Ligand binder design. Structure first.
Ligand SMILES: Cc1cccc(C)c1NC(=O)Cn1nc(Cc2ccccc2)c2ccccc2c1=O
Ligand SMILES: Cc1cccc(C)c1NC(=O)Cn1nc(Cc2ccccc2)c2ccccc2c1=O
Ligand SMILES: Cc1cccc(C)c1NC(=O)Cn1nc(Cc2ccccc2)c2ccccc2c1=O
Ligand SMILES: Cc1cccc(C)c1NC(=O)Cn1nc(Cc2ccccc2)c2ccccc2c1=O
Ligand SMILES: Cc1cccc(C)c1NC(=O)Cn1nc(Cc2ccccc2)c2ccccc2c1=O
Lengths: 79, 79, 79, 79, 79, 84, 84, 84, 84, 84
């Protein structure tokens, strides 16, 4: 047997109130807040990559090798 | 047997209130806040990569070798 | 048997209130705050990489060798 | 048997209030705050790498050799 | 048996209030604060690496040899 | 007077404002005003006798959460002769 | 007077403001005002006798959370002759 | 007078402000005002006798959290003749 | 007068401000004002007798957290003849 | 007068400010004002008798945390004839 990333909860009672709960989070992006007020942005681009936004990426994979989650704002000119 | 990243909770009672809970977080990005007020930005790009934004990347993988989570703002010209 | 990164909690009572909880955090980025007020930025880029933003990367992997979590703002020209 | 990075808690009572909790943190970046006020930045880049932002990287890996968590602001020209 | 980086707590009582807790921190970066006020920065880069930002890296690995956590602001031209 | 001008450009923005008053903004925030969370009570054999004559009595297991803006929040108020 | 000008450019922004008053902004924040959290009480054999004559009595297991802006927050108030 | 000018540029920003008053900003912060957290009480055999005549009495296991802005926060107030 | 100018540049910023008043900013901070944390009480056999005549009495296990801005925070106040 | 100029550059910033008043900023800080932390009380056999006539009495296990800005914080106040 093998357990990985497992949340387990067990409870037992006779009389009263019983609460049992389990939660799991794998590859989760939570709570991203961004505010821009009275911001001046001037961009001149000639054949390049410019990124000034908000990016939130969450990736979960099983048995995956060589995977890329996020590749933002790049110039790739391989031969 | 083998346990890795396992959250376990157990409780037992006879009379009263019982609370049992378990939580797990693997590859989680939480609580990213960014504020830009009265900011002046001037960018001139010629064939390059410029990144001035907000990036939040969370990646969880199993049996994955050579994986890249985030690659932001790069110039790659391999031969 | 083998335990790694395991959170365990156990409780027992007869009468009253019992609280049992377990939490686990692996590869977690939490609480990133950034403020820019009245900031002047001037960037001139010619074939390079410039990064002036906010980057938050969290990566969790199992059985993964040679993995890179974050590679930000680089110029790579391998032959 | 072998235990590594294990948080364990056990409690027992008959009458009253019992609280049992366990927490684990592995590869966690917590509480990063950055403020820039009335800051002037002028950057001229020609084929290089310039990084003036905020970077927070957390990586947790098992059975991974040769892994790099963060590689920020570099020029690599291997032959 | 072998224990490494293990936090253990045990408590027993009959009547009253009992609190049992255990915490573990491995490869954790906590509480990084940076303030720049009225700062003037002028950078001219020609084929080099310049890093003037805030970097927080936390890496936890098991059975990993030759791993690098952070490599910031370098020029590598190996033959 | 407030004047903003932009002449002979390719892309131009000219904004002029006399008086400006900003307001409140909440982006990805959580608020808790007057919140009761997680109350557990266990009673086995409780004996209670109450004799109330012209008054306010609050007994037992009571959980009250109140949020008042332009008024008063009371649990037990035994008053008299409230005028105007 | 407040004047902002930008002449003979490719990209130009000209902003002029006479008076500016900023406000409150909450980005990714949490607030707790008047919050009761995590109360546990165990009672086995409790004897309680209350004799109230023209008053405010609050007994038992009581958990109160109050948030008042322009008023008063009271738990037990035995007053008299409140005017204007 | 306040003047800001930018002439003969490729990218130019000209901003002029007469008077500026900044406000409060909370980015990734937590606040706790009037918070009761983690109260545990165990009572086995409690004997309580209360005789109240024209007053405010608060007994038992009491947990109160109050947050008042423009008012008074009281637990037990036995007053009289409150005017204007 | 306040003057800011930038002439004959490639990238230029000209900002002029007459009067500036900064405010409060909290980035990744925690605050605790009027907070009760971690109170444990164990009572086995408690005998309590209270005789209240025109007064404020607070007994038992009491945990109070108060945060008042423009008012008074009281636990037990037995006053009289409060005017204006 | 306050003058800032930048002529014949490639990248230039010219900022001029007449009067500036900075404010408070908290970056990654923790504050504790009026905080009660870690109180443990054990009582086995307690005998208490209270006879209150026109006064404020506070007994038992009491934990109070108060934070007042523009007011008074009192635990027990037995006053009279409070005017204006
Ligand atoms: C809650 C409570 C219980 C028992 C004893 C008392 C004194 C209180 N407190 C208050 O009534 C507070 N109050 N007073 C007034 C004014 C007023 C009250 C009664 C009669 C005539 C005028 C009021 C008017 C308009 C909207 C709200 C309110 C308010 O909220
Ligand atoms: C809570 C409580 C219980 C018993 C004894 C007392 C004194 C209090 N406190 C208060 O009533 C505080 N108060 N007073 C007034 C003024 C007023 C009160 C009563 C009658 C006429 C006018 C008021 C008016 C408008 C909206 C709110 C309020 C308010 O909140
Ligand atoms: C809480 C309490 C219990 C018993 C005894 C007392 C003195 C207090 N304290 C207060 O009532 C404080 N107060 N007073 C006033 C003024 C006022 C009060 C009563 C009657 C007429 C005017 C008030 C007016 C408007 C909104 C709030 C308030 C407020 O909050
Ligand atoms: C808490 C308490 C209990 C019993 C005895 C006392 C003296 C106090 N303290 C206070 O009432 C403090 N106070 N006073 C006033 C003024 C005022 C009070 C009563 C009647 C008329 C005017 C007030 C007005 C407006 C908003 C708040 C307040 C406030 O908070
Ligand atoms: C707490 C307490 C208990 C019993 C005895 C006393 C003296 C106190 N202390 C205070 O009431 C302090 N105080 N006083 C005043 C002025 C005032 C009070 C009563 C009646 C008329 C005016 C006040 C006004 C507005 C907002 C707050 C306050 C405040 O907080």
């Amino acid at each position: 047997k093998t357990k990985q990333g497992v949340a387990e909860a067990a409870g037992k009672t006779k009389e009263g109130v019983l609460y049992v709960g389990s939660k799991t989070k794998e590859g989760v992006v939570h709570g991203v807040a961004t505010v821009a007020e009275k911001t001046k942005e001037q961009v001149t681009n000639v054949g390049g990559a410019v990124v000034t936004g908000v990016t939130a990426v969450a990736q979960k994979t099983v048995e995956g090798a060589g995977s890329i989650a996020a590749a933002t704002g790049f110039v790739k000119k391989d031969q």
